[PDB]
């Protein structure tokens, strides 16, 4: 699986937009959306939000968790804990990239938000590195990774799974 | 020895010993041969070159920049070490025998040892010239064509020892 595909799944997440156009309810296959009333918030999937923002048809509102105080608390909790902590969104990195790259004008203090999300990303990838090293050193049979996100797993998981396949075959080659 | 190469004096134009001459893979006797067409074109090239000292140092088609050529040489040197193909080695073997026989017969006809020798070092010189030509192309082996170009270059350097 590619990072673009993980972004494709991340684009299904719901975000709130303020349209500058009028449109009645539209019945999409994945779920009806709207009605789109000018100047009023409406919740839509992230791909449609980014598309309308690109076409100058709405203002994006940040999610409730894109807040400097909340993100600082989450970052400090992540650095304080040893296990992966529950993240505000299951696709927080991709949400941050899309929303801040396309709507930094709408989202206040986007620099702080981006830096805090990067801090959490660095901490959690370091934790994943430690988990992989502990797995291979202790010859564990399985691991528990409850609060990892899909992008975090996808970044390093192909290498880790291939290495563990090799390790399993090496430790089991005396089967008779 | 006499400033210009003097064809009447022959081998006296070279003062280098045979032992140090044998260590050179290729020896050019680059004579300056007068010719009006070459002289005209050369003078035009020189004058345009002197005029081109002001034109922003622009690059030329079908050419590698000096820095890029330098880095490419370093890359090819560290990466590729070629060898000779078997049939190419057979070709080089046969041509070496013919060349050595020619050198011996020339020395016998002159009744004087030639200044420039033809030895096993010259054989290995042809070998490593072919390997250099292959290393330009990052090929693990030197083909019969690479050995042919090596023989051509060494033949230019051997006409220069006739």
């Amino acid at each position: 699986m590619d990072a673009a595909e993980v972004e494709f799944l991340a684009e299904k997440e719901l975000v709130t937009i303020i349209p500058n156009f009028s449109l009645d309810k539209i019945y999409l296959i994945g779920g009806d959306l709207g009605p789109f009333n000018p100047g009023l918030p409406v919740e839509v999937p992230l791909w449609l939000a980014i598309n309308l923002k690109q076409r100058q048809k709405c203002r994006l509102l940040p999610p409730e968790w894109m807040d400097v105080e909340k993100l600082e608390k989450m970052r400090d909790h992540e650095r304080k804990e040893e296990t992966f902590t529950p993240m505000p969104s299951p696709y927080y990195m991709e949400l941050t990239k899309l929303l801040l790259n396309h709507a930094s004008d709408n989202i206040p203090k986007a620099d702080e938000i981006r830096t805090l999300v990067k801090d959490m990303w660095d901490t959690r990838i370091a934790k994943l590195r430690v988990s992989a090293d502990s797995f291979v050193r202790q010859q564990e049979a399985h691991a528990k990774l409850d609060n990892l996100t899909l992008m975090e797993i996808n970044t390093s998981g192909t290498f880790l799974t291939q290495a563990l396949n090799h390790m399993y075959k090496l430790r089991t080659n005396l089967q008779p | 020895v006499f400033g210009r190469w003097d064809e009447t004096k022959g081998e006296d134009n070279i003062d280098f010993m045979p032992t140090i001459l044998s260590r050179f893979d290729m020896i050019f006797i680059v004579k300056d041969e007068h010719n009006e067409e070459r002289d005209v074109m050369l003078a035009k090239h020189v004058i345009t070159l002197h005029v081109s000292a002001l034109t922003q140092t622009q690059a030329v088609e079908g050419e590698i920049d000096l820095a890029k050529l330098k880095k490419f040489i370093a890359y090819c040197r560290v990466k590729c070490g070629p060898r000779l193909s078997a049939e190419a080695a057979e070709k080089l073997k046969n041509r070496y025998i013919i060349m050595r026989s020619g050198a011996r017969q020339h020395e016998r006809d002159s009744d004087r040892r030639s200044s420039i020798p033809i030895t096993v070092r010259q054989l290995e010189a042809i070998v490593r010239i072919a390997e250099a030509l292959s290393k330009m192309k990052l090929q693990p082996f030197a083909t019969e064509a690479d050995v042919e170009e090596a023989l051509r270059l060494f033949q230019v350097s051997t006409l220069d020892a006739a």
Partner: protein, 195 residues
């Protein structure tokens, strides 16, 4: 040792990890098949000699040539199969009609296999729906935008957009067109997606 000519086929394919297709090594294939023929003739002579004459010491060298024959078979079959894998990737990475500079590298039987594979794939694609099937060769990357801006790299002929509407693909001309219409030409290198 016997096997080295077969190993040259293997080393030829292993020295190109990028998946591009070298020229078919017809001469090497002929040589390894000739070697197998000679080995089999010797093995048959020796084995019938041993069995008819009651001579027992031949059996180790019988097994030697038998294993050598099986080795030759494994090498050539692996060579052909990996070439098939490289050829099969061309239909998806480039398209149906391969360029002649690449088609010159393929054997005639390889082109036969490729045409049969293309017909089977098109039959499978047609059978996925009631009418017109589903062209699964398209949509190779996730979709980002409904329309894209494309730039013509090759001086090229008229390209139909829809029925009477068409665009001339002259070099350096730049069009704004649907992604699903432009995907194949971008993958073939006729068009360059920009932004």
């Amino acid at each position: 040792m016997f096997c080295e000519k077969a190993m040259e086929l293997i080393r030829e394919l292993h020295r190109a990890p990028e998946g591009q297709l070298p020229a078919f090594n017809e001469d090497g294939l002929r040589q390894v098949l000739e070697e197998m023929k000679a080995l089999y003739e010797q093995n048959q002579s020796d084995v019938n000699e041993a069995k008819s004459g009651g001579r027992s010491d031949l059996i180790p060298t019988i097994k030697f040539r038998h294993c050598s024959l099986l080795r030759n078979r494994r090498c050539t079959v692996a060579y052909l199969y990996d070439r098939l894998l490289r050829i099969r990737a061309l239909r998806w990475e480039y398209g149906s009609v391969l360029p002649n500079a690449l088609r010159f590298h393929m054997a005639a039987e390889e082109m036969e296999w490729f045409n049969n594979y293309k017909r089977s794939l098109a039959t499978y694609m047609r059978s996925l729906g009631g009418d017109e099937g589903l062209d699964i060769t398209q949509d190779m990357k996730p979709p980002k935008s409904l329309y894209i801006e494309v730039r013509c790299l090759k001086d090229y002929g008229e390209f139909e957009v829809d029925d009477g509407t068409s665009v001339l693909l002259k070099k350096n001309s730049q069009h704004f067109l649907p992604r699903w219409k432009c995907e194949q030409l971008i993958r073939q290198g006729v068009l360059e997606h920009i932004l």
